[PDB]
Amino acid sequence: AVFYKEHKLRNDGLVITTNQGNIRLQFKSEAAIEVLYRADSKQLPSFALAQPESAIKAQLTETENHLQFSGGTLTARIQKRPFAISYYRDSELLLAEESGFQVKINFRFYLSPGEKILGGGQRILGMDRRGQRFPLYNRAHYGYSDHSGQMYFGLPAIMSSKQYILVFDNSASGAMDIGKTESDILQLEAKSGRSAYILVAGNSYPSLIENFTQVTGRQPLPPRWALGSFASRFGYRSEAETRATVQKYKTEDFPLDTIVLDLYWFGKDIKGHMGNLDWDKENFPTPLDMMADFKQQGVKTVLITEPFVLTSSKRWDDAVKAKALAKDPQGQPKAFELYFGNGGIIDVFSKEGSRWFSSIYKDLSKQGVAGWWGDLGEPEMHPEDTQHAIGDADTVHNAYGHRWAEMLYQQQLDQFPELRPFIMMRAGFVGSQRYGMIPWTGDVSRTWGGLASQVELALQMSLLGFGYIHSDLGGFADGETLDKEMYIRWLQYGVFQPVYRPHGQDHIPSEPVFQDEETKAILRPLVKLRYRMLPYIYTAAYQNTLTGMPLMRPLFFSDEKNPALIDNKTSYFWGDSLLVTPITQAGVESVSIPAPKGVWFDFWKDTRYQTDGAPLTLPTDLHTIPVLVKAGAFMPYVPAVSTTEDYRSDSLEIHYYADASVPLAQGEIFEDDGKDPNSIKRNQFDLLTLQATHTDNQLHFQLARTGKGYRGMPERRATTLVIHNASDQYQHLDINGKTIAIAQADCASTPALACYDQERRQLQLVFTWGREALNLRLHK
Ligand SMILES: *[C@H]1[C@H](O)[C@@H](O)[C@H](O)[C@@H](CO)[C@@H]1OS(=O)(=O)O
Numbered sequence: 001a002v003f004y005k006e007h008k009l010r011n012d013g014l015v016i017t018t019n020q021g022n023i024r025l026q027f028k029s030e031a032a033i034e035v036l037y038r039a040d041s042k043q044l045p046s047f048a049l050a051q052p053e054s055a056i057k058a059q060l061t062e063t064e065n066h067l068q069f070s071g072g073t074l075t076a077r078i079q080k081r082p083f084a085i086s087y088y089r090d091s092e093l094l095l096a097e098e099s100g101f102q103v104k105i106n107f108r109f110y111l112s113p114g115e116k117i118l119g120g121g122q123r124i125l126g127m128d129r130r131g132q133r134f135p136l137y138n139r140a141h142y143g144y145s146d147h148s149g150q151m152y153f154g155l156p157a158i159m160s161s162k163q164y165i166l167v168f169d170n171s172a173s174g175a176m177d178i179g180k181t182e183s184d185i186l187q188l189e190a191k192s193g194r195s196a197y198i199l200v201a202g203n204s205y206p207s208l209i210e211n212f213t214q215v216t217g218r219q220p221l222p223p224r225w226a227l228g229s230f231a232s233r234f235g236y237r238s239e240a241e242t243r244a245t246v247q248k249y250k251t252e253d254f255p256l257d258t259i260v261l262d263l264y265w266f267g268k269d270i271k272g273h274m275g276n277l278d279w280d281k282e283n284f285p286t287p288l289d290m291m292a293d294f295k296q297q298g299v300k301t302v303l304i305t306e307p308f309v310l311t312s313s314k315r316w317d318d319a320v321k322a323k324a325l326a327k328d329p330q331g332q333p334k335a336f337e338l339y340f341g342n343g344g345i346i347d348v349f350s351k352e353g354s355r356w357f358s359s360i361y362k363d364l365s366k367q368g369v370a371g372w373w374g375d376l377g378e379p380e381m382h383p384e385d386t387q388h389a390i391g392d393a394d395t396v397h398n399a400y401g402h403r404w405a406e407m408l409y410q411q412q413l414d415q416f417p418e419l420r421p422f423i424m425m426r427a428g429f430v431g432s433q434r435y436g437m438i439p440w441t442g443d444v445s446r447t448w449g450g451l452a453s454q455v456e457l458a459l460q461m462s463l464l465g466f467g468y469i470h471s472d473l474g475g476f477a478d479g480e481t482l483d484k485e486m487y488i489r490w491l492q493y494g495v496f497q498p499v500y501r502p503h504g505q506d507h508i509p510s511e512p513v514f515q516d517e518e519t520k521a522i523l524r525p526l527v528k529l530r531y532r533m534l535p536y537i538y539t540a541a542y543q544n545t546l547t548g549m550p551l552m553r554p555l556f557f558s559d560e561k562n563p564a565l566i567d568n569k570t571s572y573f574w575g576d577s578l579l580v581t582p583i584t585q586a587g588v589e590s591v592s593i594p595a596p597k598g599v600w601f602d603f604w605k606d607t608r609y610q611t612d613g614a615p616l617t618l619p620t621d622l623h624t625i626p627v628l629v630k631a632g633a634f635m636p637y638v639p640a641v642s643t644t645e646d647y648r649s650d651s652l653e654i655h656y657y658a659d660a661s662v663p664l665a666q667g668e669i670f671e672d673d674g675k676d677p678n679s680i681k682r683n684q685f686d687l688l689t690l691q692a693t694h695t696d697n698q699l700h701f702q703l704a705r706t707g708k709g710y711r712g713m714p715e716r717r718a719t720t721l722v723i724h725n726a727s728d729q730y731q732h733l734d735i736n737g738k739t740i741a742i743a744q745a746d747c748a749s750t751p752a753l754a755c756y757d758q759e760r761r762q763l764q765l766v767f768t769w770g771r772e773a774l775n776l777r778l779h780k
């Protein structure tokens with residue numbers, strides 16, 4: 001039994017007092033509200049919020065039975081007796097408290113009938129998680145396949161078909177019950193920690209995500225090289241083996257940006273060395289030379305680190321001496337029995353642990369390390385009586401990796417202010433994207449089921465802030481012999497997901513360069529294609545930095561008024577223009593693609609398909625996976641390079657997919673130096689835009705560039721524009737008023753400026769795209 005007693009305004013925040021205590025309401029933006037219960041008391045601070053202290057000016061009005069606290073779009077409606085807060089966008093009800101806050105920590109809300117609920121981060125349960133209950137405790141799920149209620153990276157958040165996001169801003173061991181125990185109740189629970197939630201609203205899913213990342217944090221543009229080809233396994237045993245692998249990429253003609261070094265870099269066994277955090281010199285005798293030799297070939301080195309320091313490690317005594325480790329309640333270093341041996345955990349929440357760990361990263365980064373892999377940050381083992389500077393293990397658990405990322409991010413920005421940090425980690429929290437976290441989906445089994453789950457996992461993480469979620473390509477765990485077909489399918493899909501990082505236990509090769517001739521003949525052109533497509537991918541990355549928009553988008557974005565599409569986890573958008581349907585079983589001979597209505601082209605074959613709703617059946621082959629291009633797409637390409645260190649857009653090739661059904665279309669290509677963390681803030685970029693206007697007798701392109709450019713930007717780019725499904729009735733072309741005849745023969749065999757290929761229905765234009773505006777007009 002809870003009821004309103006009184007309220008005060010204090011610094012734009014509403015402080016309500018009930019019989020049970022104080023409640024602080026602060027708008028963190030016009031569409032986002034933080035609700036803090038037990039506001040009177042000492043609590044852990046917010047982890048989810050980018051600006052925890054902020055509170056924007058809202059309006060307050062009072063009635064007999066209710067209070068109303070409003071920003072721009074979002075309104076909190078506070079019923080006085082019994083006490084219950086509900087949330088409105090306009091006057092549409094988003095979410096209503098049931099009993100609300102109780103005692104343990106517990107929050108209870110009503111779910112509306114038919115409401116679909118995404119969220120929880122990494123689970124394999126179906127896209128709509130309504131009807132499920134699961135814990136909020138980051139934890140390993142080694143060898144998972146087609147099911148999981150609990151994995152490496154849970155998020156205490158949900159997204160609803162009402163277009164709100166709800167965050168439980170609490171770091172502790174907890175649980176979420178999404179209308180499972182009681183049909184119409186969403187319940188959030190924790191053992192301890194902060195008693196706060198955050199509601200974010202939007203008018204569309206893109207706007208919701210923009211609003212969410214506004215208040216939780218925007219991912220800073222990663223270095224372009226993170227969009228490249230990684231060489232990885234668990235693990236290279238020696239400097240000789242790592243060098244032989246870089247070489248294998250060069251001798252096999254596969255692109256390679258980065259090689260990743262797993263735990264053998266600091267010791268010859270899996271057990272007993274963790275915490276050494278220094279080179280095993282018997283096996284890596286000349287590591288500075290190794291890294292410099294790789295950097296000459298345009299190849300970066302990334303090293304694994306973990307939170308644990310073993311008692312058998314060279315750094316135990318020093319970490320104890322420095323007070324860097326978490327303690328027991330008695331005050332001494334907490335040691336416990338990991339797989340690797342008896343050891344402690346670095347306390348990234350303390351000043352002393354942060355300084356000791358940071359100094360180690362600094363030293364290795366000085367030696368030549370370009371990037372960092374933080375594994376086991378769940379933490380993988382985290383006994384409940386472990387004490388951190390700000391709380392016990394069970395209170396801080398789900399924020400350990402998040403703070404570990406923050407610590408490493410700040411450290412890398414301090415050491416290399418002119419570089420973009422690369423931080424790859426397994427476990428975080430809501431907002432960890434603001435520290436550049438690039439998550440992967442853990443120790444997936446080498447099964448079709450493991451592959452068939454990756455889209456669900458990726459979309460779930462993308463929707464709640466994590467654009468660079470990806471999988472270990474080809475699979476990680478167990479197996480005795482390569483499953484060739486599954487491997488190929490997984491590396492094909494790889495091209496159309498955020499990070500191209502095949503990785504697996506080393507009794508079976510993860511790297512495509514160690515595969516048989518047929519496998520390499522299939523994958524080599526695809527890995528190159530990933531490089532040729534860098535302007536498409538880097539431009540989606542740019543939009544993710546700008547607005548939260550994930551790189552992988554779900555089918556349901558295509559029609560916001562058809563909630564049944566939410567269930568789809570087999571087809572997704574890669575950027576604006578490509579609808580990808582990975583093949584996730586052996587021997588599949590054809591697929592049915594639930595393409596949204598409109599006109600679509602086969603990416604590989606150029607076939608045009610029109611549909612008014614019905615799915616398209618495409619045949620499959622072993623050399624590709626089904627990809628459709630949306631009519632009105634501009635697909636930009638550059639020539640393939642071996643490494644992004646050689647990236648140039650001096651030569652562009654742009655493919656436009658024309659159809660009269662699309663009378664206006666736009667595209668954009670974002671170019672900058674690929675490395676400057678301040679490029680966007682300072683406008684040190686070249687932003688190419690393209691607009692097509694398609695009427696009955698004309699097809700008009702307007703091309704332009706904005707931004708202040710950057711050092712080494714080409715002034716003039718040689719541009720080949722290829723118009724697919726181009727009319728055969730275009731007689732002339734004007735480029736900026738200068739008329740050019742369209743050749744109708746020998747397009748492939750003359751240096752033609754404009755040429756129509758009648759057999760392929762393609763019209764090719766070749767021109768110079770300089771700093772001034774350009775108009776290309778085709779007319780019948
Ligand atoms: C952590 C990662 O999930 C996996 O990709 C690594 O290859 C391995 C080895 O460092 C880690 O798992 S574990 O074996 O240490 O548990």
Ligand SMILES: O=C([O-])C(=O)[O-]
Pocket residue numbers: 659660695696726727728729
């Ligand atoms: O649609 C057109 O413009 C045509 O195909 O002739």
